[PDB]
């Protein structure tokens, strides 16, 4: 009933039609799949793959010759994970899923179910209990990095994702952008703004499942170069993964970073400017990369949204905001798709499944050409 073609072109009438449908009593009562449904469905992997329409064969030789690794950190919403995995799944790639140690038993079993169906999807060999804004969020990605670097020698790039991400490019287009990177990494990395300093000048501790400022003053970072500011999300070469897992100075930086607030938002940005890190850029601010100029992740921050022809980096959210981040509505997609980033965040089947559906369809159609 929803014309996804009109949605992707940005037709206000079709968008309004989605907005109205979302408001109905009938929509909010719609039947949802449970983690138990997934435990059930994945007993028969052949039928699960067929039914859910995973892609079982690589689409081009170009893609076959360019394997990609993914690290996916999740804790809930099994249906969104299955949609995300299906959208990015290729037989030649690798997928490590980190399930939060605190997640529900049934969710963890459902993730293991899905993973058991694929030789190249698997659960991280070590799980962290992930506390919001803490080191354990970084630690989750490092765990996956460790597994992936050991399991195969031939993948080119690692991309980290969360459970509520969605691709806005096909595998083929991602591979081509990565080939265009020429062994360089790509992620946000900008001069540290002075209002983010309280996050690492002080020691933070977990008090009652919650990361809190102790007020204790930290030693300076063990680094010649500056700290840089960025995001949790990155696109990095295998050689970078290797270096970071084994280099001693990087290790000291990480150990120093453990008791900071949101270390994920400076750790990667910072390492990317250390000389000798594979794929790194010089620390000169001429090479700084903003979130819009990097390709890693398109994200809309509430306080930045506005009139793009008036200086706003992107137009207002059409979904809803959660902690200042736009969760995308169908009205966001048109503009989003003209951007160069590989993935976007956040989506949510509970808020606007029509956004995901149209994006999902468009990408599958586009790929099968
Ligand atoms: C596993 O699933 C099958 C199919 O159930 C359907 O799909 C599921 C994912 C979920 O959405 C269910 O609500 C759907 O009905 C189950 O087989 C069904 O069993 C019910 C109850 O006896 C029956 O009414 C249906 O006709 C059956 N459908 C089919 C296709 O056989 C099955 O019971 C589930 N098994 C377990 C162990 O939970
Ligand atoms: O209890 C939690 C909460 C968060 N996460 C993960 O941490 C990452 C970041 O979560 P989110 O994007 O919601 O944090 P925020 O958007 O508020 O910065 C995601 O991969 C989540 O799956 C987690 O593993 N356990
Ligand atoms: C959806 O809209 C497009 C573009 O306006 C139109 O060409 C197409 O026929 C429509 N699809 C259906 C099945 O109604
Ligand atoms: Na597996």
CA distances from 218 to 198, 221, 268 (A): 10, 8, 20
Q: What is the resolution of this structure in A?
A: 2.3
> What letter does residue 219 receive in the DSSP assignment?
P
Q: Please tell me the chain's helix, strand, coil percentages from 3-state DSSP, rounded to the nearest 5.
A: 40, 15, 40
By alpha-carbon position, which residue is closest to atom 1 of ligand 3?
3
Contacts of 244 (CB under 8 A, 6+ apart): 145, 250, 271, 277
Sign of dihedral through CA atoms 283, 285, 287, 289?
A: positive
CB contact at 8 A, 145 and 243: no
Convert 265-314 into a string of H (helix), E (strand) and C (coil).
HCHHHHHCCCCCCCCCCCCCHHHCECCCCCCCEEECECCCCCCHHHCCCC
CB contact at 8 A, 107 and 195: no
By alpha-carbon position, which residue is closest to atom 8 of ligand 2?
162
Phi–psi pair at 70, nearest 5 degrees: -125, 140
Contacts of 6 (CB under 8 A, 6+ apart): 13, 14
Q: Is the CB of 258 under 6 A from ligand 3?
A: no
Phi–psi pair at 217, nearest 5 degrees: -80, 125
CB contact at 8 A, 287 and 279: no
Q: Which residues pair with 98 in a beta bridge?
A: 73
- Tell me how far apart the terminal alpha carbons of the chain are, to the nearest angstrom: 25
Sign of dihedral through CA atoms 105, 160, 284, 184?
A: positive
d(CA 118, CA 21): 36
**Helix 353-367 to helix 12-23 angle, to the nearest 10 degrees?**
130
d(CA 72, CA 80): 12
CB contact at 8 A, 41 and 49: no
In terms of C-beta density within 10 A (0-12 exposed, 13-18 middle, 19 or more buried), how is residue 176 classed?
Answer: middle
Spell out where the chain has E strands: 68-74, 94-99, 121-123, 157-162, 165-167, 186-187, 190-191, 202-206, 211-217, 228-229, 234-237, 297-299, 320-322, 325-327, 343-345
Q: Please check if 100 is assigned to a binding site.
A: yes
Report which of 167, 102, 85 is spatially closest to residue 363, judged by C-alpha positions. 167
Q: Which residues pair with 217 in a beta bridge?
A: 202
Whose atoms come closest to the Cα of 108: which ligand? 2
In terms of C-beta density within 10 A (0-12 exposed, 13-18 middle, 19 or more buried), how is residue 30 classed?
Answer: exposed
Count of alpha carbons within 13 Å of 292, Cβ hemisphere only? 9
Q: What phi-psi label fits residue 276: left (phi over 0), alpha (psi between -120 and 50 degrees) or beta? A: left
**Helix 78-88 to helix 105-116 angle, to the nearest 10 degrees?**
20
- Ligand 4 centre to CA of 157 (Å) is 20
d(CA 198, CA 337): 36
State which of 97, 126, 130 you would mutate to test the pocket of ligand 2, scoring each by most atoms of that ligand within 8 A of its C-beta. Answer: 130
CB contact at 8 A, 348 and 165: no
Cβ neighbours, 10 Å, residue 367: 18
Q: How was this structure determined?
A: X-ray
d(CA 359, CA 161): 17
Q: Give residues preceding each break in the chain, C–N over 2.5 A.
A: none
Contacts of 12 (CB under 8 A, 6+ apart): none
Instruction: Give me the active site residues, please.
Output: 265
The tokens of 225 are what?
A: 């170069």
d(CA 260, CA 140): 16
d(CA 12, CA 213): 46
Question: Measured at the alpha carbon of residue 320, what is the angle toward residues 367 and 190, in degrees to the nearest 5?
Answer: 75
d(CA 361, CA 170): 11
State which of 40, 109, 113 you would mutate to test the pocket of ligand 1, scoring each by most atoms of that ligand within 8 A of its C-beta. Answer: 40
In terms of C-beta density within 10 A (0-12 exposed, 13-18 middle, 19 or more buried), how is residue 49 classed?
Answer: middle
What is the tally of helices (H) and strands (E) in the chain? 16, 15
Q: Is the CB of 6 under 6 A from ligand 3?
A: yes
Contacts of 170 (CB under 8 A, 6+ apart): 363, 366, 367
Contacts of 128 (CB under 8 A, 6+ apart): 98, 100, 101, 136, 137, 139, 140, 143
H-state helical runs in 119-184: 135-151, 171-181
Q: How, if at all, do strands 343-345 and 157-162 pair?
A: unpaired
Count of alpha carbons within 13 Å of 101, Cβ hemisphere only? 13
d(CA 350, CA 28): 9
Contacts of 1 (CB under 8 A, 6+ apart): none
Ordered strands of the 165-167 beta sheet: 165-167, 343-345, 297-299
CB contact at 8 A, 83 and 358: no
Q: Which residue has the tokens 């690794």?
A: 69
d(CA 120, CA 89): 9
Cβ neighbours, 10 Å, residue 214: 11
């Amino acid at each position: 009933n929803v014309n996804c073609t009109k949605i992707l072109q940005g037709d206000p009438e079709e968008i309004q039609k989605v907005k109205l449908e979302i408001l109905t009593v009938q929509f909010k009562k719609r039947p949802r799949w449970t983690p138990h449904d997934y435990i059930n469905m994945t007993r028969d992997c052949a039928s699960f793959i067929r039914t859910r329409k995973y892609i079982v064969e690589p689409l081009t030789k170009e893609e076959v010759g360019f394997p990609i690794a993914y690290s996916i950190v999740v804790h809930h919403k099994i249906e969104m994970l299955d949609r995300l995995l299906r959208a990015i799944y290729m037989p030649q790639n690798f997928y490590c899923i980190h399930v939060d140690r605190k997640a529900e038993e049934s969710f963890l079993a459902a993730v293991q179910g899905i993973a058991s169906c694929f030789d190249n999807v698997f659960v991280a060999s070590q799980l962290e209990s992930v506390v919001y804004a803490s080191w354990t969020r970084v630690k989750a990605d490092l765990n996956c990095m460790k597994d992936l670097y050991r399991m195969n020698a031939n993948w080119k790039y690692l991309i980290n994702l969360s459970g509520m991400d969605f691709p806005i490019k096909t595998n083929l287009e991602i591979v081509r952008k990565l080939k265009c990177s020429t062994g360089e990494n790509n992620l946000e990395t900008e001069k540290m703004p002075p209002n983010k300093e309280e996050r690492w000048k002080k020691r933070y501790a977990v008090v009652d499942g919650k990361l809190t400022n102790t007020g204790i003053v930290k030693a300076p970072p063990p680094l010649k170069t500056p700290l840089f500011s960025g995001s949790a999300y990155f696109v990095v070469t295998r050689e970078y993964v290797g270096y970071v897992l084994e280099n001693e100075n990087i290790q000291k930086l990480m150990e120093w970073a453990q008791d900071t607030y949101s270390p994920d938002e400076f750790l990667w940005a910072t390492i990317q400017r250390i000389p000798e890190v594979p794929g790194s850029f010089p620390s000169s601010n001429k090479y700084d990369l903003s979130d819009m100029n990097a390709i890693a992740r398109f994200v809309k921050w509430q306080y930045f949204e506005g009139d793009v022809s008036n200086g706003a980096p992107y137009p207002p959210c059409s979904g809803v905001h959660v902690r200042s981040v736009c969760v995308f509505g169908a009205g966001d997609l048109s503009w989003m798709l003209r951007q160069h980033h590989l993935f976007a965040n956040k989506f949510d089947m509970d808020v606007d499944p029509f956004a995901i559906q149209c994006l999902d369809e468009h990408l599958r159609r586009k790929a099968l050409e």
